[PDB]
Amino acid sequence: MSTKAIYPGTFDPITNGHIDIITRAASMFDRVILAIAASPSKKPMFDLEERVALATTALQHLPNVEVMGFSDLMANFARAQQANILIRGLRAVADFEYEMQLAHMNRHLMPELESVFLMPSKEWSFISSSLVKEVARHAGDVTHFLPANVHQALMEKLK
Amino acid sequence: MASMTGGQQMGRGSMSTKAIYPGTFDPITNGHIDIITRAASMFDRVILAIAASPSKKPMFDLEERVALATTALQHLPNVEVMGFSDLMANFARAQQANILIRGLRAVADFEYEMQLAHMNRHLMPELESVFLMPSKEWSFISSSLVKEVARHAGDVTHFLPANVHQALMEKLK
Residue spans per domain, chain B: 18-171
Q: Which residues, 6+ apart, have CB-to-CB distance to A26 below 8 Å?
A: A32, A62, A64, A65, B13, B14
What's the distance, CA B125 to chain centroid? Answer: 20
CATH superfamily of A4-157: HUPs (3.40.50.620)
Quick one: residue B38, left, alpha or beta (phi over 0 = left, psi -120 to 50 = alpha)? alpha
Q: List, as ranges, residues 80-119 from A with C-beta within 8 Å of B.
A: 84-85, 90, 93, 96-97, 100, 103-104, 107, 114-119
A129 is in an annotated binding site: yes
Evaluate whether B19 touches B47 at the Cβ level (below 8 Å).
yes
A22 is in an annotated binding site: no
The Cα A107–Cα B137 span in angstroms is 12
Tell me phi and psi for residue A102, to 5 degrees.
-60, -40
The Cα A114–Cα B164 span in angstroms is 27
Whether the CA torsion A14, A27, B100, B118 is positive or negative: it is negative
Solved using: X-ray
B129 — contact with chain A (CB < 8 Å)? yes
Q: At what angle do helices A129-137 and A148-157 cross, to 10 degrees?
A: 50
Evaluate whether B127 touches B100 at the Cβ level (below 8 Å).
yes
- Asked if B133 and A114 come within 8 Å (Cβ–Cβ), the reply is no
Task: Look at residues B139, B150, B140, B134 and name the one whose alpha carbon lies nearest to residue B59.
Answer: B150
Just give the CATH number of B18-171: 3.40.50.620
Strands ordered across the beta sheet of B18-23 = A65-70, A31-37, A4-9, A85-89, A114-118, B128-132, B99-103, B18-23, B45-51, B79-84
Chain B closest CA to A131's CA: distance in Å?
Answer: 21
- Of the candidates A31, A104, A117, which has its C-beta nearest B104's C-beta? A117
Evaluate whether A31 touches A78 at the Cβ level (below 8 Å).
no
**Residues preceding chain discontinuities in chain A with C to N over 2.5 Å:** none
What's the distance, CA B157 to chain centroid? Answer: 21
Evaluate whether B117 touches B40 at the Cβ level (below 8 Å).
no
- Cis amide linkage into residue A44, ω under 30° from 0: no
**A91 in catalytic set:** yes
DSSP SS3 for A61: coil
Count of C-beta atoms within a 10 Å radius of residue B17: 20
Evaluate whether B130 touches A116 at the Cβ level (below 8 Å).
yes
- Asked if B131 and A90 come within 8 Å (Cβ–Cβ), the reply is yes
- Give me the residues paired with residue B45 across strands: B18
- Asked if A93 and B107 come within 8 Å (Cβ–Cβ), the reply is yes
Chain A closest CA to B6's CA: distance in Å?
Answer: 16
Q: What angle do CA A105, B100, B125 make, to 5 degrees?
A: 125
- Asked if B111 and A90 come within 8 Å (Cβ–Cβ), the reply is no
Beta strands in chain A (DSSP E): 4-9, 31-37, 65-70, 85-89, 114-118
3-state helix, strand, coil in chain A (%, to 5): 45, 20, 40
DSSP SS3 for B112: helix
- Asked if A96 and B113 come within 8 Å (Cβ–Cβ), the reply is no
Catalytic residue among A79, A91, A107, A157: A91
Write out chain B residues lying below 8 Å of A104, CB-based: 133, 136
B12 — contact with chain A (CB < 8 Å)? yes
**A41 in catalytic set:** no
A60 — contact with chain B (CB < 8 Å)? no
Q: Is B162 exposed, middle or buried (0-12, 13-18, 19+ CB in 10 A)?
A: exposed
**Which H helix or E strand runs over B145?**
helix B143-151
